[PDB]
Amino acid sequence: VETFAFQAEIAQLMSLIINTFYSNKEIFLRELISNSSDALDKIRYESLTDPSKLDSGKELHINLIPNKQDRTLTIVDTGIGMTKADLINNLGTIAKSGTKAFMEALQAGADISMIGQFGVGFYSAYLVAEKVTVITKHNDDEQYAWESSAGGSFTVRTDTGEPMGRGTKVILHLKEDQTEYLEERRIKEIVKKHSQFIGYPITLFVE
Ligand SMILES: Cc1c2c(n3c1CCCN(C)C(=O)[C@H](C)Nc1cc-3ccc1C(N)=O)CC(C)(C)CC2=O
């Protein structure tokens, strides 16, 4: 297991997300589904030039999986996935400028729900999750587990769990007072409200 420090701007963003009073937390789901949709767009596009990129799985979909016993909500996709370099360096570098602009927009009157316009919507996970685990598999790289409970650090390790083929699973370990997001009615409501037209099947598992 390797431990890394977040870029300072990203630690800053995470603290703002965790500490700011903001009741409209449900937008986290739209942001994660959007990340998945983007990842699915990417593998779909690449497979047009090289169909063998789908040897790791032809189905392009999104699954939402609540687990009350574990108090987790998992967003699973069969998108392009992420390499080790993506997880440690590349995406965080990109996130830096997005974070700076977002925090500036907030100072100017924007609100947290606009986070996705700055490319850092992933971090809205921390509106509802005390810990986030990202298990990911990209073609031509290994399966990795990224994890962070905030506090300025994240870990990356090779994942020994069930092989995924290709794609990403974002496991939200929910805060004690955020269990409404494990309820079927509540998730259905949020998907209908904010993610109605996503161009891939979204299956809401039940318990
Ligand atoms: C930015 C950013 C970040 C993450 N994603 C994106 C968003 C960057 C744009 N984007 C969607 C991608 O680069 C790839 C393809 N897919 C994903 C990225 C992210 C989340 C989910 C997916 C996912 N579900 O595949 C996750 C990590 C852990 C690297 C932290 C972070 O800064």
Tab-separated table of N, CA, C and O in Angstrom, residues 29 64 183-194 204 206:
chain	number	residue	atom	x	y	z
A	29	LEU	N	-24.753	12.165	-6.507
A	29	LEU	CA	-25.020	11.004	-7.353
A	29	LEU	C	-24.931	11.369	-8.832
A	29	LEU	O	-24.356	10.632	-9.625
A	64	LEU	N	-26.118	0.761	-9.851
A	64	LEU	CA	-26.128	1.418	-8.548
A	64	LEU	C	-26.494	0.382	-7.494
A	64	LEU	O	-27.570	-0.213	-7.544
A	183	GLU	N	-31.769	3.948	0.347
A	183	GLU	CA	-33.178	3.619	0.125
A	183	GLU	C	-33.522	3.625	-1.357
A	183	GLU	O	-33.192	4.569	-2.082
A	184	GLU	N	-34.201	2.574	-1.803
A	184	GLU	CA	-34.603	2.471	-3.199
A	184	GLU	C	-35.384	3.691	-3.692
A	184	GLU	O	-35.078	4.237	-4.750
A	185	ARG	N	-36.399	4.105	-2.932
A	185	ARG	CA	-37.236	5.238	-3.321
A	185	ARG	C	-36.397	6.489	-3.522
A	185	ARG	O	-36.625	7.267	-4.445
A	186	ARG	N	-35.428	6.682	-2.635
A	186	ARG	CA	-34.642	7.905	-2.641
A	186	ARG	C	-33.694	7.931	-3.834
A	186	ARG	O	-33.554	8.955	-4.508
A	187	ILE	N	-33.027	6.812	-4.091
A	187	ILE	CA	-32.124	6.755	-5.231
A	187	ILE	C	-32.889	6.915	-6.551
A	187	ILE	O	-32.447	7.645	-7.437
A	188	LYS	N	-34.031	6.236	-6.679
A	188	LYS	CA	-34.869	6.356	-7.878
A	188	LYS	C	-35.245	7.816	-8.142
A	188	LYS	O	-35.172	8.303	-9.261
A	189	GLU	N	-35.663	8.495	-7.080
A	189	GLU	CA	-36.012	9.905	-7.148
A	189	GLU	C	-34.855	10.747	-7.705
A	189	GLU	O	-35.041	11.577	-8.599
A	190	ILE	N	-33.658	10.534	-7.166
A	190	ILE	CA	-32.495	11.343	-7.531
A	190	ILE	C	-32.069	11.101	-8.975
A	190	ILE	O	-31.754	12.040	-9.709
A	191	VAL	N	-32.073	9.837	-9.382
A	191	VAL	CA	-31.748	9.484	-10.758
A	191	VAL	C	-32.744	10.117	-11.740
A	191	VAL	O	-32.348	10.683	-12.759
A	192	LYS	N	-34.030	10.035	-11.421
A	192	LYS	CA	-35.056	10.637	-12.272
A	192	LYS	C	-34.874	12.152	-12.368
A	192	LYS	O	-35.040	12.751	-13.431
A	193	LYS	N	-34.527	12.771	-11.250
A	193	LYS	CA	-34.396	14.227	-11.199
A	193	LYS	C	-33.192	14.778	-11.968
A	193	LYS	O	-33.303	15.779	-12.683
A	194	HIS	N	-32.045	14.121	-11.820
A	194	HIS	CA	-30.769	14.681	-12.257
A	194	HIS	C	-30.044	13.898	-13.353
A	194	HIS	O	-29.102	14.417	-13.966
A	204	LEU	N	-30.727	0.121	-10.963
A	204	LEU	CA	-30.701	0.293	-9.523
A	204	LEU	C	-30.995	-1.044	-8.863
A	204	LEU	O	-32.133	-1.536	-8.930
A	206	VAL	N	-31.676	-3.663	-5.816
A	206	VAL	CA	-32.424	-3.552	-4.569
A	206	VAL	C	-31.911	-4.589	-3.577
A	206	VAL	O	-31.117	-5.447	-3.938
